[PDB]
Design a protein around this ligand. Structure first.
Ligand SMILES: Nc1ncnc2c1ncn2[C@@H]1O[C@H](COP(=O)(O)OP(=O)(O)OP(=O)(O)O)[C@@H](O)[C@H]1O
Lengths: 234, 456, 445
């Protein structure tokens, strides 16, 4: 995953709605249903702060025409007092409202994430050291990192299974991205190109707050060159 | 006639379901259960009120063409001794009958009471009856065009061996609806009609030759015969000729009174002696083609190309090999380009040839609620393994004994620890177990080389 | 009973063919019209002289069990535009009947004359008759082993005593060369068996027997084991039973889910279960003296045409190994055109059938490897089919990719082709997006 840094307080409507927090599932559900009018601004801010990448899968839902929905990091049915806490909101793929929620859904719409979440073992994008928990393989899978304790590995696997991050669709997309990265590596080796001018297209954002999808795979593929590019321009 | 949406409620497998349909081709995919058969049966049941208006009804006592007490939903609960039904069962259909005539009609059944239908379902019978009336008033200058209904199940090849005119008459025109929604094979009806057609064509040809004084009256009978034959043969060629090379289905008396086909290098051979896939495909296309010819005689050559209707096909790609599976859908859309096809399949080769908006993946939950969704990723023109993993959720790598070792080796190699003796021993063991040319091992070697190159 | 080699001369579509068979499993692979059914029919004809030695088939006057006039080869004379019949049609088989009994026999038909067998083909009938005689022995303390003969074609879906006597034993050859297997009949007779066993089992609880009870227990054990070899690894299902408590249905068990009915599954898997169970039940009937090991120790030949009908691609990858595990001493000869089936067998067990312009046939081992290989690689190599379908714009996409690769993106024709492909395929096509990223990449330099 990628760590998301929040640098915006929120919106006036969201702040006012949080003055009197809901205190049970029914109130949270009803008020979230009634809040549909001012959801667009909150979602716009959330998508801008993430550089247009899904909070869990790092895909460009806009470029695929799948949309976004507002996700609660911690289920509002578990702790409804945070239904309007801006610090507990992110943007996930597969907008809420024929390809939609189902058995194969991933992210906030995944089967496991909808039922229950154990926050002790949950690794998410709002934890500063989440990126070291995961590794991306050459066949499309995502696995826990080797340099992890016997306790951190259990958390990593639990998080991977909770969000259904190893579905066939995600595996195929990640495999294709790896193949394209191999192509680019061979190309720059052949052409005597420089491996920093090209990488700025993929690792450095744009004035419209956009990032290429699968940031972590690209960063992990070019071990030290990616780090040099990131440190130079961030 | 066209159907845009269907909703089921307390039907066989689904507690509830809503499914829309594409305008030209829709493909249903289901890993578990018999959802696809349920949807096809529901559409077939919703289409029957129209055929009822042509005197085509349960006169042969077809009990499957109505909702039965065996179609309702029964819930078995392990903690209770009693088992109840779910009532009512309902089928609702939305669509179009004529140009600009949109309608919605519903059929329902309550318990053991006789099935009942609403007022639009009765208007659907009235429309068929007025079409019949217009067909019987042939002393007219205007032309009326009839649609096509057809159902092709998995038992369309089971007992092929068990069992005539062509004109603008009501009796001849309404014979195209005979057994059009039947679940059994229809091959001998076609074989007999095609034999009569060929024999009449030849006999009238010789009769005209020996006395052409009837050129203006009998010279246009033979032209109609020839045009019908040509339409049927063109439709069949569109499916068989390019992939297999066989073409021009004919009736031959010198071959023991049999249907024969021609091949450039294999000559003339009877159809019954050809392969299973060829016979299946020929039967499938012939059904539609001669029903089109008989329904709309006034469209001489373009009977197949200018007819409208709905065709349901269960396991469209039966007995066909992967090269043939990559061309069946386009062949069907070329032979009959004005018809709406609803088919079922489980072949990635077929799925790679359509856009993701023509695919419906069916699933259920524990309580019976159903969903018919679209694929999340692109499928049009993609490789077969991509479709197989992304859509059907099947890993192209088979679960052989060495698969787990391969996964472990990949996980170790990609994370930088490839110079350790354990990793190298695993690498050599897998190289001897699967060969050094395995694609995954090759890409792992590429990864090792890249990691070595970076550290410099 | 084992067949090692087969030779055909002037048969249906083969001017000549010689095919060698593997000891445990052989798979014939080819497109449609190649001659898979032809080879299966030749093998089925070569085995009929043995079945004709039993009274269960001594009355079988079926004309499909002999060489017909329609089996002789026809040659197309293009200059004369005619069909010429070639005679005679011959089938020669080699193999082992009993341990240490190697033989070669032949059958031939000439023109419109009736088919004729040679001297050694009558000894196969004599051996079958001797086996039948030995089965009808009362005080014999030396066991008699019967082989399993079975043919399961593409029409296998269209449609007891269980004693230790001659009639029950030889009932295992009932319609064996034209066998049928659909789940309705399987459910019927399995339910009958389980009802009888339940009756005898309750009678012991009420008032705390022999041959008829143990023969019912052993058959159920063997059939359950055989089906377990099929279902227990892909899923957790095992131990198919009949339950009256579950509304009088057949059910399976799962350690985490409990009991589930068999009638909630798809037709393909139910038919696979029926096929495996029918093979096991025939093995049990043929050799009672093997008790619950009958399926694991019986020998014979089983022919299957289209082994993967109505099977999901997940079950096509675990069907050959299930058959090999359930019946380790039987010789299987199956046909298929699916690459998922082929991605799980060694290349020594595969035969590719081809011809030439003159009709000479060949049946050869694949050149490349196929075990543990991805399906797309098997599709490309063994079958010669490109995994990427030839859609209308495929050539245009390839041409655009070639042009962009060599660095000509700035020419007007390239841009026009790009716009045409955008309007046709769309703006979110993955290949077009890759091309645009490549174009942007080879700038800023
Ligand atoms: N007497 C004959 N002379 C010449 N060719 C014949 C004759 N009988 C049949 N053929 C040809 O033999 C081929 C039939 O082969 P077959 O049906 O066994 O092939 P297949 O597709 O591999 O099998 P199946 O689809 O039944 O599994 C067809 O080309 C048919 O034209």
């Amino acid at each position: 995953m990628r760590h998301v840094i929040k640098t915006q307080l929120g919106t006036v409507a969201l702040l006012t709605a949080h003055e009197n927090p809901p205190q049970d599932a029914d109130q949270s559900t009803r008020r979230w249903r009634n809040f549909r009018r001012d959801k667009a601004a909150v979602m716009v801010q959330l998508i801008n702060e993430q550089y247009h990448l899904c909070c869990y899968s790092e895909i460009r839902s806009d470029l695929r025409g799948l949309g976004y929905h507002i996700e609660h990091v911690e289920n509002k049915s578990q702790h409804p007092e945070r239904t309007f806490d801006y610090q507990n909101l992110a943007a996930s793929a597969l907008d809420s409202g024929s390809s939609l929620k189902g058995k194969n859904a991933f992210g906030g719409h995944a089967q496991g994430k909808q039922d229950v979440v154990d926050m002790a073992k949950f690794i998410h994008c709002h934890i500063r050291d989440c990126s070291r928990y995961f590794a991306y393989l050459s066949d499309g899978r995502i696995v826990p990192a080797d340099e992890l304790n016997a306790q951190e590995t259990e958390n990593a696997q639990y998080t991977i299974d909770l969000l259904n991050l190893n579905s066939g669709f995600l595996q195929t997309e990640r495999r294709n991205h790896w193949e394209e990265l191999e192509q680019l590596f061979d190309e720059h080796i052949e052409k005597d190109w420089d491996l920093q001018q090209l990488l700025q297209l993929d690792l450095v954002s744009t004035p419209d707050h956009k990032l290429h999808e699968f940031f972590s795979i690209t960063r992990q593929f070019f071990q030290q060159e990616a780090e040099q590019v990131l440190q130079s321009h961030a | 006639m066209r159907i845009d949406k269907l909703s089921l409620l307390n039907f066989r497998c689904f507690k509830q379901l809503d499914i829309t349909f594409d305008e030209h081709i829709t493909i249903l995919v289901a890993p578990n259960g018999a959802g696809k058969t349920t949807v096809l049966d529901a559409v077939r049941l919703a289409l029957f009120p129209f055929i009822r208006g042509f005197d085509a009804s349960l006169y042969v006592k077809d009990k499957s063409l109505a909702i039965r007490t065996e179609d309702l939903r029964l819930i078995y609960r392990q903690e209770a001794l009693n088992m109840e039904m779910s009532s009512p069962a309902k089928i609702t259909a939305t669509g179009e009958w004529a140009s600009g005539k949109t309608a919605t009609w519903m059929l329902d059944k309550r318990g053991e009471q006789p099935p009942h239908e609403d007022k639009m379902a009765a208007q659907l019978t009235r429309w068929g009856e007025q079409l019949q009336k217009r067909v019987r008033e042939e002393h007219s200058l205007q032309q009326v065009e009839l649609p096509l209904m057809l159902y092709l199940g998995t038992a369309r090849l089971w007992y092929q061996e068990r069992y005539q005119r062509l004109d603008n008459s009501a009796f001849s025109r309404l014979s195209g609806y005979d057994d059009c929604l039947s679940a059994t094979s229809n091959y001998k009806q076609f074989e007999q009609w095609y034999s009569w057609l060929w024999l009449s064509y030849r006999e009238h040809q010789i009769t005209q030759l020996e006395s052409p004084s009837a050129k203006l009256k009998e010279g246009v009978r033979v032209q109609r015969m020839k045009e019908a034959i040509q339409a049927i043969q063109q439709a069949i060629n569109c499916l068989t000729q390019q992939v297999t090379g066989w073409h021009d289905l004919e009736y031959s008396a010198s071959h023991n009174q049999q249907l024969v086909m021609s091949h450039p290098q294999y000559g003339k051979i009877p159809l019954s002696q050809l392969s299973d896939g060829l016979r299946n495909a020929v039967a499938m296309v012939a059904d539609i083609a001669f029903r089109c010819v008989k329904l709309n005689p006034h469209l001489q050559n373009d009977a197949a190309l200018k007819t409208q209707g709905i065709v349901l096909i269960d396991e469209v790609d039966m007995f066909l090999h992967p090269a043939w599976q990559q061309q069946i859908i386009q062949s069907l859309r070329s032979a009959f380009p004005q018809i709406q096809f609803i088919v079922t399949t489980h072949s990635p080769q077929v799925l790679s040839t359509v856009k993701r908006e023509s695919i419906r993946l069916l699933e259920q939950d524990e309580n019976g609620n159903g969903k018919a969704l679209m694929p999340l990723g692109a499928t049009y023109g993609e490789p077969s393994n991509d479709v197989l993993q992304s859509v059907m959720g099947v890993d192209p790598q088979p679960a052989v004994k060495e698969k787990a070792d391969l996964q472990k080796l990949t996980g170790w190699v990609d994370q930088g620890k490839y110079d350790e003796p354990k990793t190298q021993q695993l690498m050599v063991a897998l190289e001897v177990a699967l060969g050094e040319k395995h694609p995954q091992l090759q890409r792992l070697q590429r990864s090792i080389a890249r990691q070595r190159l970076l550290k410099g």
